[PDB]
Every structure is written in structure tokens, then in C-alpha cells.
Amino acid sequence: PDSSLFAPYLPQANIPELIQEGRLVAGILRVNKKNRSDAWVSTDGALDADIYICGSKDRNRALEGDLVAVELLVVDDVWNDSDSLSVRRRSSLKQRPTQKKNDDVEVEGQSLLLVEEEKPLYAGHVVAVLDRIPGQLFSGTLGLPKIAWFKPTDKKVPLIAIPTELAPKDFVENADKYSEKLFVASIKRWPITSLHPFGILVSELGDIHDPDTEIDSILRDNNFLSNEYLDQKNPQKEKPSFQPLPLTAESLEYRRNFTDTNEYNIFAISELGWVSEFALHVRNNGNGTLELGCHVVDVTSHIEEGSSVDRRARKRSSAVFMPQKLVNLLPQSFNDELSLAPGKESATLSVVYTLDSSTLRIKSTWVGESTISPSNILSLEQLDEKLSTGSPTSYLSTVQEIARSFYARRINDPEATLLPTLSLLESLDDEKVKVDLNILDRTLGFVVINEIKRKVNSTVAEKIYTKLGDLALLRRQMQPIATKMASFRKKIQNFGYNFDTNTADELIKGVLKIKDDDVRVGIEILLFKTMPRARYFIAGKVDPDQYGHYALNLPIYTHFTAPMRRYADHVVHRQLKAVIHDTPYTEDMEALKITSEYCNFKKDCAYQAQEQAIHLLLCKTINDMGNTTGQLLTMATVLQVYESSFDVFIPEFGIEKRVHGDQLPLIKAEFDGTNRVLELHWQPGVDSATFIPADEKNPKSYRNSIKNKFRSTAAEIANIELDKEAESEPLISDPLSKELSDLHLTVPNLRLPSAQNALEKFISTTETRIENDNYIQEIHELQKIPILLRAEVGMALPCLTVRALNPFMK
């Protein structure tokens, strides 16, 4: 409690007992991307909150994602530059220091939404690292003489000291020549005697803004080398020896047969750019009951457990889906040969529900090995077409009503309709296969199939836990920590919504009740920020009272429906077959624990890769749409107001960003913390679109490294956009429009004022007043505001930035 020197770690042997006595508690370390000097350790229900870790010393060289042992401290013993900290109305304009402004543009701008942050109840320091996924990789840049400094693009990773004996030979002399090159590094050691970790160079990726390098860098930074199947002789191809194993007649005879096309009309579901791994049938049984059959490719029946393919697929762990590219879980030969197709007989694992034909209540459930021969194959796009423009009593209409009844029971709302849906909560559990430029996009067809798969996964989880108990591989998702729920509740209450938030049940119903699409999306964004992603886990390692999946309002869950892209499903499939055949399941609980946590690591990496690649292409699209103006102008909704800044979200783009007062031509600002109202005092006649803050002409400012420096006046942007609106003409260039079309992506739509010159149409949406020489604009939560939108180009990742239009411009 005096100096700032790292303490050596406690020996591993002591921790197990010390945890049992309550002297230490274990948890996962997460660094605050905004304020990197601090970190939190989340407990798996071992305490009422997260443990605050203040400063570098108390973090004791732990890294993001580490499992750490922490010793608690008196919060008082443990116990500024932010313009978003928020008696009555008072002057609050805050100029962030150059370094803080620079860091904010990256942290806020390099993700689609804004990360959340916020004397704590608990505080501690790290006394040991209990576990770390080994061999983690980091993309970044290298600069300068015995040490070269590697700067990770991941801002939760500290600078890494690279002994210059590992950097390229001619780097010490011309380090500036490599400033625009991307490297991959790893952390090798971090002793108490060094303020920084030491690491090694793994690869040189290439030019920082080369499109292929950009994607390769995203993959490597998220630990996807994607080399498990390549042939040494020829690297362009995969090793032909990797092939699915065919089934013997002994198995095929024993499977429940669904191949008679006179009795079952099975349609395989395909996803754009991906295989078909899920198929369905609906059948009238004739005795007042219906049947919904749910069929999943029986991947593991083609893979010998422990074989080379299994190990290499376990290493990959998750497929990766990006708008620009996809990376398989399995060898290409498996995708091609195992993808469900009409007329092709395929081994499957099926969950078949018998339903009351009038209420659709589930009368019974069958789970077992099967064989199908699809009669049809539909894409989700084709499913959508048929569900909107088709007979309201058709085959597919019945599937929708079944999905709706599953959904209504899941969220405990009998009258529930499948839309509106919660796209962000879905992403807490899984990633998109067909990726959209807007993370908010979900179609009815996807939701129908998704709610059926959620029921199937629920059924399989219940079955394997009942029979295998402590060895079951399950998936849970923890409710928001009390403090974050209390913050979320305060926000929606300020909005005027006072619905119950004590259970996922009532909270989700309150959100879904909101008629205003913008508000409903905004509140979902706020809710999404309070929760970490779901986690695979082994049942015996967790209290059975904490198996719940909060976001899905399910008491138990696992992953069974996507074995072609998730390795966890392979484990679940092998567990289900043991239960089916009542054979002894003899896997070590500790081995399964290591398997589940690795699956968590690679799956969260696949999620990060997907959103990073979306963000990259979206920034390119935003800049192409404003190719002549250097920026876009669109209506946005205010989500949160602070003393010197405010957050806006743009549902048409699926982004949430922060307007900073110190980047606007202001005289002052006043903040009313009781009413959540920020009053901007504008400089009359100064266009925000072209304003350069005085402090950003410093060569230390991020602005100096901006490559796309040109900004047109606001009037020019308004004119071009509104003229094109009436005309139904595109802002996007023809080359990029072709690119997005090939990728089956949709150009974002602007939100324009539906009202006079073009600029005046935007300005008339603002709430303004002139008090003598004060030119005041009021910023209210959930108000619409015109926002200038740009992607700053220059860093490894572009930075989205937003500015309020000056309503007192000429």
C-alpha cells in the first residue's frame, strides 16, 4: 500500500485450499478497453459482483481472458480525463487531453457499438494466474537499441517488448520503413522485474491497408491460422487423405428411416455460402396429432474419435463467417460430401416432436439416430419469400406457427409473434452464418428455423444431463450483474419505461412491447452491453441452480444443431449417442472441462472476427457512399446524454457512437443531470462538417495520420443525399455495389428528414433557441438529431466518428 512493484505469484499448490477457505476467489480477468489501467474479474457466481482491479500493480501481469486468483482488499485502501462521466444545470464542456482523444477515437470507433464501463462493492489484486489459453496471437505494428516495440491492434493487450534480435535484420536501421506493416506476435514472458511483457514475432502479414492482409490479420489476431488441413507438397490445396468415413450396414439398418418420400416431405435448409446441416419435416399423423421432425447431420458418425481429422477439427474448434470470407470447421471434402441435398441419403441425429394438432402442445419427444433423404432444399431467403408471398395455410405456414408456439412458450407470452426479434441477444449465444452488413438484421425465415433449433438444443441438453449428469457438455449464459442491471433499469426509467426487470421473462417482454422501432433497438443495445456471451461448461463443474441461459430464458441449454461449424456439437453428439445406445461414457471430467473452455475461446474469437470484418467493410461502404463529400449526414437517435458528450445509434447501420463536445465548434455546454439534458452553446455560422478543433492541429493528434482528410460542407452533403432520395438513386459507387451484390449484402439506407433547402430540412429537426448571444441546442435522450458520419482511415482498423450538425450554420 505504498509502492508500485509487482509481487511474485503464489505457488499453484496453495490456491485450491485457499479458495475453499474463502481467502482467495477465482475469476476471469477483463481489462477496460477505455481505461486500460483498470480491470475487472468476473466470478462464476462466487460473489455478488465483479472484483475491481486498480492499476497495473494489482493486475500483476495477468492478461485479458486469464483465469486468475484474486485476494480481496478493503475498498477504501484501494481508493478525470473522460467527457462522459455523468447538481442542476451547469457549465460542463470538457476538453479531453490529446492522448485521451487519440485513444477514444480508436476504442469508440473500431467497434460497431460502444463498450460499457462503470466506488465498487469489491476490489482486489491478482496473486496468481490459474489458467491461460496458450499460444495466443496478436496482430499489430512494430516500431523502435535492444528492444523493438510491438503495438497490438487489440487495445486490451499491453505493448510487447520484442528483442530486436527477433525483428527483421534491416529493421534497426530503417524502422520507419516498416511502420505500415502488420506483424503477428506472441507473449513469451513477463517477470516481476519488467513493467511490460516480452514476446516474439510470429509472422509478417503485409501492408496494413491491403484488403487481403486486413482479413488475414483479423483471422490471426483471433487465433485462426487455418492451416490444419493444408498439404505440405501443395499449400493451395487440402490434403486429399482427409475424407469422411462411410457408414457400415450394421449402423444403417438400425437407424430410424425417413427416406420414404411418400411418408415424409423433408426439406433441407441451406444458408447462403454455407452447407445444409439441418432439415425438417411436418407430418399429420391422423390421430389429432402432428409431427415436427428435426434432423441434424450426424457428422461424428463419419469421424473416428481421436483421429487426425478429429484433432485438427478440435484445434480449429469453430468456423468463421465474415462478409468477405468464410473459414470451414472441417475439410472442404466433408462440407461437399455431407451437405444435405435432395435425393441424397444422409445419416442424421433427429429430434421428433409429436404435437397436439389444435394447441400444438408437445405430446411426446423422440430422439435418436436416423437416415433422411430430403425431398426439397430451401435457402432461408427462399423460405422468407414463401412465408410472405404464399398461401397462409401451406406446409411452410404450419412450420412457422409451430416455431411461433415454441417461441411463445420460451418467452412465456402466449400471444407472441416471431417478429420483432432480438438480434443482439442472439449474438450472445451464436454467430451468423450468412453475415449482414447490419448486425441488427434478422429475417422471419431465420427466426422460424432459429426458434425450432433453440427448442431442439433445449431437448438435447435435458436428455444428456438426465442420463450422463456431471459429464454433460452444456451451455449457460449468466444474468447481468446486479450493478449493471441497476444501471440498465435507471436508463429505461429515465426513458419513461417502468417495466419489470427482475427476470429475463418480464424484461424481454417489456422490450418486445415497445412499438417504436428506434427505442426498442436502443433499449436492446443498452441491455446487450450488460451481459457477457454464453459459455460452454461441464455440468459437474457448476451448481445445477446456475445452468440457466438468461438471454434465452431457458433453464438448461447446449449446442447440438450446427456440427458442421461448431466443434462443441461434436462432443454433444458423441454424448447423445452414448445416451441413445446406453453405452458407457468414460471421458475424464477435467479433459472435458479443458475442451469446453477451449471451445469458448475459439468461439468468442470467431464472433470477434465476424464483427471486425463487418466493421471493416461497413467503414469502406460509409466512405464510398460519401466519396465526394468525405462524410455522410443522417438522422440518428440519442441514446445517452453526458456532461460533455452523448451517444447516438443509427439502426440503419447497426452502430452506436459518441458525439464529443470537444470536437464541435462550441462556446460552452451546460448539463442538467436531473433531467438528462445537454445544452450545446454553438459558435454561430461554423460548420461542424469542416471544423478542425484547435488541439487537433498538433502533430501528436490522431488527425495528423488521417489519410482521408477532405470534408465537404454540410450543405453539399444534404443536397446530394436528398436529391438522390426522391430519385431512388444510389450514393454507393458501381464497383462497390457489384462487390456487395456478389457477397449478397445490402447497402445501408440513410434516415432522412421527411419534410426549403436540403440543409434546412435537417436543421428543422433540431431543438434550438437564441438567448441574446447564446445559440443553444438541446440534446435529449431518444430525440432524433442530424449526425455527420465518417470512417477515419489511417490505423490498422478504421475509426467511425460522429459529429452533430451545427443548427446555427449559414
Numbering used by the authors: 336 to 414, 485 to 491, 498 to 529, 536 to 561, 579 to 1189, 1194 to 1248
What text comes from the article?
To better understand the molecular basis for the function of Ssd1 as an RBP, we solved the crystal structure of the core folded domains of Ssd1. This truncated protein lacks the first 338 residues that are predicted to be natively unstructured but is sufficient to bind Ssd1-specific RNA motifs in vitro. The overall structure of Ssd1 retains the RNB family domain organization: two N-terminal β-barrel cold shock domains (CSD1 and CSD2) sit at the mouth of a funnel-shaped RNB fold. These are absent in Ssd1 (5), with the structurally equivalent residues being Ser704, Val709, Glu711 and Phe712; this configuration is unable to coordinate a divalent cation. This segment blocks the lower tract of the residual active site. We conclude that the S1 insertion locks the autoinhibitory segment in place, ensuring a fixed, inactive conformation.
Ssd1, a conserved fungal RNA-binding protein, is important in stress responses, cell division and virulence. Ssd1 is closely related to Dis3L2 of the RNase II family of nucleases, but lacks catalytic activity and likely suppresses translation of bound mRNAs. Saccharomyces cerevisiae Ssd1 binds RNA, but does not have detectable exonuclease activity. Transcripts associated with Ssd1 were enriched for mRNAs encoding cell wall biogenesis proteins and Ssd1 was shown to repress their translation.
